Paper text:
In three-dimensional (3D) classification of the [name] [name]-nsp7-[name] complexes, we observed that a portion of the particles appeared to be missing the nsp7-[name] heterodimer. Further 3D sorting and refinement of these particles yielded a reconstruction at 3.5-Å resolution, which largely resembles the larger complex. However, in addition to missing the nsp7-[name] heterodimer, this structure also displays a significant amount of disorder in the fingers domain index and ring loops, which play a role in template and NTP binding. We hypothesize that the binding of the nsp7-[name] heterodimer to the index finger loop stabilizes the polymerase domain to permit template recognition.
The [name] RNA-dependent RNA polymerase possesses some minimal activity on its own6, but the addition of the nsp7 and [name] co-factors greatly stimulates polymerase activity. Though additional viral nsp subunits are likely necessary to carry out the full repertoire of replication and transcription activities, the [name]-nsp7-[name] complex so far represents the minimal complex required for nucleotide polymerization. The [name]-[name] RNA-dependent RNA polymerase resembles a cupped right hand with fingers, palm, and thumb subdomains. Although not previously predicted, the [name]-[name] [name] contains two metal-binding sites to which we have assigned zinc atoms.
Author numbering:
A (entry chain B): 80 to 191
B (entry chain A): 118 to 217, 222 to 403, 413 to 426, 456 to 542, 560 to 840, 854 to 891, 907 to 919
The structure:
């Protein structure tokens, strides 16, 4: 039992270090009674956003250029990694080079 | 200045749908510009799986449907003020919502709307009747409501809709199902919540969380859950400023997505249509056999039910379950064989179910079970974890084992085909039907598109055994727990957490049984509809003529359950519509002399019922009718049936398709294949017999003999 107990505690504390922040306090403090839906916490506490894009047209309407808007925030792209785990530059994502990209691409961005 | 068609014709066209005789529906959709005429030249234009665009087209009737509901409420106020007492029907209201009864006293009237709304209910989520209500003043021509993300209750919003559209539905409504007096009331309210919830944000639903503290350190945990069907359910055993967490509390928290999603990455996934919450991050080919042989959830839609019918059918469904035993068992009474099963995320990062069953004492297992009778734990599954399965067995296993140990019953789970079992099961369904024919059918998307309302009905049926061990509040929390754990749980896919819209779960304890409750419900519904939809004045048999009359009056009148009527109706179905049911697999032996008159359901009733009950179209390609009982069902338990001589008598034997068998302690697998192939040697086609013999040669080279195999069919 002890092995499991330790694993659960280790995991919960790792998450607590990530979780305990000002953003969490702001969403809970704005609640009428301290209760919020879980599905809206990441929209306020996640500083980092993962965007998964299946093709070029979607990319243009999702993450065109250095910044984009999502969850009522402006996001700044830090990196793009393809389906083969290679680094792709923003300057490399265009119509002409679309056939050479390992779609879907995953875009990593931070809150502006 | 009335329209050509009435609300009754729209409801009939959608509920008694036939892709052949679909002229009423096609004309209405063209007439009101839902689609053009060329729309009906598409292959399978009426399907929901193929050509999913049909939903866009049905939705174009949504404004028309809410206008009819609003006109009804205004009509009802007018007749109330006028002192008029009477009944509202769908053939007295046209498709523009226009209306066309006795007087008692000014200010004292009352509408009867029980059939009025129940008949419409199945098409209100189909046509998106409340599509306008997501807009600021409930007008599609204006912008959407900027709903507060932190709003999680919506009690007032549901009450406002209830009193706007169903004002005269004179039955107590409990937006939060936790306040229901019995299981019937639970289904009564949930049915409204399904429709009302269609206009609330997707983020407003799901686990509800709070900041709590342990040793001064904040955690985000679930302290309740918001269900699309059940409303808001709060937890009671929520303890803040604790010093340490117990093993049990740690299991509850580890399983709780509140800790994982709130602490993860934001996720925008454009590859899907499903709602996501957070990212948590940044075959065996048997060549030897082959060479030897060669040498020789996106479719799960909110679905509203006809409640007057659902509450009748469920009593009939319960009768079909009035032979087995059930109730609650303790932790030390639970039998678990699959201890090699993954414990589920995050427990599967540490071990298999054995790791947890051998760690918790029986007292701790009982305590976790008790927790779920007072609170809700919204666990995480992966594309069902131990914090769900450890307690689902204590609640359901006695019943599941009872069903599995009972032979001769309508629901047959766990009954071997061997030693005459196939034969006995067939004789059991054939029974004494006067003019027997055999029928069977598939269920498209049975594990994906099954509505949460029918999943709730099935879990309530399985829970109806808990009468001498559970109070009302406890039964409700157990329902809330089953719903949070298998209908709207979190599922990890890859490294991210997504929300499941509904359907079934192959990892749960009850799926194989809940599916049989469902199969009966749909069949009863088909028979209730087959009889109620026919002309009662064309029935020569006075008995059935009276049965149809009384059946109508046991659904839309006489709300209290008439148990004598239900026993009689049940017996009627038992005699003329005999069912043999396995999880999503059924054979029906029916009396065609009555089906021919519309007094018994046929395949066309199943097609119409699945069309509006599960939002799926059932193709004739997988449906069958067999007129000669010399041969058995075309396919049951994925096997074909033939009558052969055995013991200077005749028996029915199953057999799988010969190509499927060859396409399929390694020797143990081959022995099982050879046994399944054995009956093929009784078949007149030598090519079938050769499958069995091929395996014996392989097995012996890897002792299985003809005698060690023929014994499997000797009682
Ligand atoms: Zn209720
Ligand atoms: Zn009980």
């Amino acid at each position: 039992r002890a092995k499991v107990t330790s694993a659960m505690q280790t995991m919960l504390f790792t998450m607590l270090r990530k979780l305990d922040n000002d953003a969490l306090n702001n969403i809970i403090n704005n609640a009428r009674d301290g209760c919020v839906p879980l599905n809206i916490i990441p929209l306020t506490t996640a500083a980092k956003l993962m965007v998964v894009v299946p093709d070029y047209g979607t990319y243009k309407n999702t993450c065109d250029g250095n910044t984009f808007t999502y969850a009522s925030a402006l996001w700044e792209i830090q990196q793009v990694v393809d389906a083969d785990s290679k680094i792709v530059q923003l300057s490399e994502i265009n119509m002409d080079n679309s056939p050479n990209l390992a779609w879907p691409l995953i875009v990593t961005a931070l809150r502006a | 200045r009335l329209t050509k068609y009435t609300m009754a014709d729209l409801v009939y066209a959608l509920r008694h749908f036939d892709e052949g005789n679909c002229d009423t529906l096609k004309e209405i959709l063209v007439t009101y510009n839902c689609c053009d005429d060329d729309y009906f030249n598409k292959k399978d234009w009426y399907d929901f799986v193929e050509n999913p665009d049909i939903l866009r087209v049905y939705a174009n009737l949504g404004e028309r449907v809410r206008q009819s509901l609003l006109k009804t409420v205004q009509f009802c106020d007018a007749m109330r003020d006028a002192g008029i007492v009477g009944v509202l029907t769908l053939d007295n209201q046209d498709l523009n919502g226009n209306w066309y009864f006795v007087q008692v006293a000014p200010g004292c009237g009352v509408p009867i709307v029980d059939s009025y709304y129940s008949l419409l209910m199945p098409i209100l989520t189909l046509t998106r009747a409340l599509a306008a209500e997501s807009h600021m003043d409930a007008d599609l021509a204006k912008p959407l409501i900027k709903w507060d993300l932190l709003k999680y209750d919506f009690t007032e919003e549901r009450l406002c809709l209830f009193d706007r559209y169903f004002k005269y539905w004179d039955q107590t409504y409990h937006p939060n199902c936790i306040n229901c007096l019995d299981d019937r009331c639970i289904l009564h309210c949930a049915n409204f919540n399904v429709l009302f919830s269609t206009v609330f944000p997707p983020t407003s639903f799901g686990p509800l969380v709070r900041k709590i503290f342990v040793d001064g350190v904040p955690f985000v945990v679930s302290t309740g859950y918001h269900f699309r069907e059940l409303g808001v359910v709060h937890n009671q055993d929520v303890n803040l400023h604790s010093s340490r967490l117990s093993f049990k509390e740690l299991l509850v928290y580890a399983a709780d997505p509140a800790m994982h999603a709130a602490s993860g990455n934001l996720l925008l996934d454009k590859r899907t249509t499903c709602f996501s919450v957070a990212a948590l991050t940044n075959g065996n080919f048997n060549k030897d056999f082959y060479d030897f042989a060669v040498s020789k959830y996106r479719y799960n839609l909110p679905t509203m039910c006809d409640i007057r019918q659902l509450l009748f059918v469920v009593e009939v469904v319960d009768k079909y379950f009035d032979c087995y035993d059930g109730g609650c068992i303790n932790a030390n009474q639970v039998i678990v064989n699959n201890l090699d099963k993954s414990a589920g995320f995050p427990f599967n990062k540490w071990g298999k179910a054995r790791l947890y069953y051998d760690s918790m004492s029986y007292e701790d297992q009982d305590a976790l079970f008790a927790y779920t009778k007072r609170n809700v734990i919204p666990t995480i599954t992966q594309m069902v974890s131990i914090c769900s399965t450890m307690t689902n067995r204590q609640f359901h296993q006695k019943l599941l084992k009872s069903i599995a140990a009972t032979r001769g019953a309508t629901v047959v789970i766990g009954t071997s085909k061997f030693y005459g079992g196939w034969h006995n099961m067939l004789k059991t369904v054939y029974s004494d039907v006067e003019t027997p024919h055999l029928m069977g059918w598939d269920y498209p998307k049975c594990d994906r598109a099954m509505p949460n309302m029918l999943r709730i009905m099935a879990s309530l049926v399985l829970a109806r055994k808990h009468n001498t061990c559970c109070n009302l509040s406890h039964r409700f929390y157990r329902l809330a727990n089953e719903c949070a754990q298998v209908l709207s749980e979190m599922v990890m896919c890859g490294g991210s957490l997504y929300v499941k819209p509904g359907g079934t779960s192959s990892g749960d304890a009850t799926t194989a049984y809940a599916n049989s409750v469902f199969n009966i419900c749909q069949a009863v519904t088909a028979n209730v509809n087959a009889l109620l939809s026919t002309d009662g004045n064309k029935i020569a048999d006075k008995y059935v003529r009276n049965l149809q009359h009384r059946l109508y009056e046991c659904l839309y009148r006489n709300r209290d359950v008439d148990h004598e009527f239900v026993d009689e109706f049940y017996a009627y179905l038992r005699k003329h519509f005999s069912m043999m049911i396995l999880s999503d697999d059924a054979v029906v032996c029916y009396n065609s002399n009555y089906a021919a008159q519309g007094l018994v359901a046929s395949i066309k009733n199943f097609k119409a019922v699945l069309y509006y009950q599960n939002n799926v179209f059932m193709s004739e390609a997988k449906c069958w009718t067999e007129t000669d009982l010399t041969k058995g069902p075309h396919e049951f338990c994925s096997q074909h049936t033939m009558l052969v001589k055995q013991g200077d008598d005749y028996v029915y034997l199953p057999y799988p398709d010969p190509s499927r068998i060859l396409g399929a302690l390694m020797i143990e697998r081959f022995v099982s294949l050879a046994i399944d192939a054995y009956p093929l040697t009784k078949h007149p086609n030598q090519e079938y017999a050769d499958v069995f013999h091929l395996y014996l040669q392989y097995i012996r080279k890897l002792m299985l003999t003809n005698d060690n195999t023929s014994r499997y069919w000797e009682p």
